[PDB]
Symmetry: C7
Subunit: 182 residues, 7 copies
């Protein structure tokens, strides 16, 4: 299991204002991040917070609780992508404090458009089709804001999977800097 230092390794790094977001985004792991963001704010609302991201994405609602909590709290939340940051992972990465969004040299980042599904009555399909296009609209606006791109460019570039290297992501505005050595 998770090794100990009585702290587990992650509790020990939480004192350093470090939070890890690992794996598929889902309601329960997302709320752990929220709780850590809220806890760290209370410990010190001025000191920066560092959110490490290695995720392929997941639930839009689950990510939005993370994204909105990052913006809502007083401390700046830096984001660093290690390994990969795809879909909601990439949106959370772009959502970090301005100038404090990083990745490492071989990180992979991918952005695409929302995925969903529904079945039932045509009237109900209409409701959910409109809800997913609105979610698509709103998520593109968040990207445009943090990257500086026009919404129409984000919508076009995310139509299909678009993978990005560290350098490409900086050119895009998805991150600020590729870190190499401390």
């Amino acid at each position: 299991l998770v090794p100990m230092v009585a702290y587990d390794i992650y509790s020990r790094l939480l004192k350093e204002r470090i939070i890890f977001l690992v794996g598929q985004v889902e309601d329960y792991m997302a709320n752990l991040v929220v709780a850590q963001l809220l806890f760290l704010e209370a410990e010190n609302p001025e000191k920066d917070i560092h959110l490490y991201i290695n995720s392929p994405g997941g639930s839009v609602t689950a990510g939005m609780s993370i994204y909105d909590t990052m913006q809502f709290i007083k401390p700046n939340v830096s984001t660093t992508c290690i390994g990969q940051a795809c879909s909601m992972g990439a949106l959370l990465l772009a959502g970090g404090a301005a100038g404090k969004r990083y990745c490492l040299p071989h990180s992979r980042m991918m952005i695409h458009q929302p995925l969903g599904g529904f079945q039932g009555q045509a009237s109900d399909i209409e409701i959910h089709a409109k809800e997913i296009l609105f979610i698509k609209e709103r998520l593109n606006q968040i990207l445009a804001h943090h990257t500086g791109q026009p919404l129409d460019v984000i919508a076009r570039d995310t139509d299909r999977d678009r993978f990005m290297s560290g350098d490409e992501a900086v050119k895009y505005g998805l991150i600020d800097k590729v870190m190499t050595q401390r």
Copy 2:
């Protein structure tokens, strides 16, 4: 994995009078909330309580145990929706203390009419069909009360799934204010 601070992260935020309702509403997670509400009432019946909600809904009986506990206890129960609050989740959100029901900019809220199912004898189907139509009326009455809407509007807007943004939810009365930055 629940991190530690010797409290775990949620026990640590429980002292600040913060309770989390995450995921599908069901008897056991619903009863934890009830117990947390009662404990906080005993710790201090005057200080407010803050209930964060990221839930797609679930059991009406489990949800009503939460709803009735929120009203029953002396302290005001504020509600903040992060991520999503759909079906029973939206009712618990609307049921928070007057003026102290919030959400974040990208929260999604959805209201609809109750869901159910049964199989057996026609005589038994009649009994259970009448019970769910009774719940449908009772739940619409609860929404009308907390939102200020006329009952016939609630019945109309909840016939099918109806999604709402933060701004829309404020105009509807479902919440009081969209929080953006602390």
Copy 3:
């Protein structure tokens, strides 16, 4: 997991010091016996102070429920019952069995009473034995309700033939509970 409180109890152990016990979900031997143990412990801690049993249950095992019911009557303290969410089948009987005048629910709780359910397979001779046993259980359970609600025996039998849902007000008019609590 179940959250923690300092002077270090988990939330339910912390409310147990306040003599509050929770019965959640389907009634079965193991969760039912936990309730029994909590009832017995609280009796030894103080045989005079009331005990509060919160119920949110759809029912379950008749024998498992009966271990709870008989423990409630057996011990000296009065066991109040409050229905939150729902109290159906064995859940409703345990609710009805609370100390006289101290049986409550909350405004939107739902309560349901019906007749016992069972099943068996085997030889006709063996079916006969178990059919008689479940008919006996039905008689005694209706007698428990009649006693605690004040209703005539034949009325309970009549009303439990099919599922019968009740609101808080209905349950008070019926005798199933004493009072609908709203605000402390």
Copy 4:
């Protein structure tokens, strides 16, 4: 998760010499009961022990390890049936200390003959068939001893499932007294 008032609730009642036997009887839960009986004997070989039984029965061998441990140790082991005590559950109840075998008003007790099954060679069936008829005789002898009934009555009444009320079980000898309110 068992609540904490620092003992877990059952450990706290274990100090009070109360042991709970719940659910299907099987080697592992049965051996816990055995362990609790031995520990309590070591803590105090004179004080009574109270064994609550809410069980539908189960393995005879696992139950017999409990039955024989109850008799072997010095303390008297009282038994109280709550909920139900059927098959091996009823035998463990009947096997409690004389005059100290109880139930509550709505407890249900059921006695019957043993159940089994086997497959293989006819010769092996014969061996195991003889083994279960021996267990059936031995178990009837255990009931007859503790209830006071004649052996042939036990054999007669256990041919099929036989349920008993509290009052009936007292009249039969399966238990001594139906408890209603504490003293």
Copy 5:
């Protein structure tokens, strides 16, 4: 779940009293716990006897052999008491207790038989394993012969099929020394 004694679990509490429990089917992991408990007790006191309670239907021969050989290897005498049942490896481990200190309780059941196995593959490989299980059969019979005092050919014959035994029968056979009834 295992109750606590104050902070001991019930079994660790009885381990101080030099008691070890062997419950259920014999397999590598539960078998090694017993070995470790035996080794620990030898280190705590190499002279005091050890009490091994056995309620098992048997299991792996290799797993059982690690217990048997550890019982003989260590200096303390390993008393054995059967509660419930002791079948197959369970009965061998019981018979393997220190001479004069092998017990059971009145309603214990013991069963002895020949080893069970299975294999599939090439005829050459079947031959290798068929001879290995016949060697295991010979060796296990010799262990029974040693501890019971019976001749080897009698063990082979009596184990051809499942053979159930009562406490009295097991004493007559040499499988155990005495049927304990009351402390």
Copy 6:
């Protein structure tokens, strides 16, 4: 069962700055290593770190989070292969601090080209085919760098599975020294 020393055995060896990477490479075990690497850097950024590897490989993104963290942090991260180090495992071994890459006499190391798969629209297949071809090139560049081999040799020798002994791995540059006795 993790044995105890008030440490579990791995927590005790973490103090001697030893980290174990065992089994298939995946986000969660990979991030544990990242956390241990960061923790050890903070305790002492100058003392070397010893990373034991017994792995057949696994997720490239998960491994790269380990790889990039090894280089990013201040301490030299020694690597010792015990048992096996194949695919991503062999890359992590070769990526250790120069001159401090070891194995034991019977360790097996294997290098090959990336594996992947996808299904869907031809246009989407095209996107991911180019992405895995990009990863293949970048990984060959990493091996070439740490082993000293020319890029075209790595491409040639990794076309199919290529197993190496300790001695072979030293001649190749994959490791620096075969340890025998301390």
Copy 7:
């Protein structure tokens, strides 16, 4: 349930420098032994270590991580077979310190040649067929070294499963002495 002594039973025997290897050999249980061997060395690099073995075999790579760690460390690692030591289990037993490899009277030991399997391209089959023939050679060399037999005898005697008694294993060189009573 592992009983407790405040040590669990196995942690308590670890102080006496006893390690248990039970069941199928696999990466995770194998690395625990490695970790315990390294810890005992650090606690005292001169005092002997006692490794009890009751295993039917398992992974060659996982077993080799154990074997090489036994040789690498300074202390002598005695080995005692209780119950059985088959396949990799028998190799680890034979690999114990010279003169300090034991068994108990009814232990069974079995040696055979390695097993493997593969599917795919004929070219890939060729690569892996050569690798398992190489592993077969390397493992036979290990037994030859520790047993004193010529390699060709080991290869021949392991062509099929070969079971051994305590006395047989001693004449063969697989173990040094059959312990009976302390």
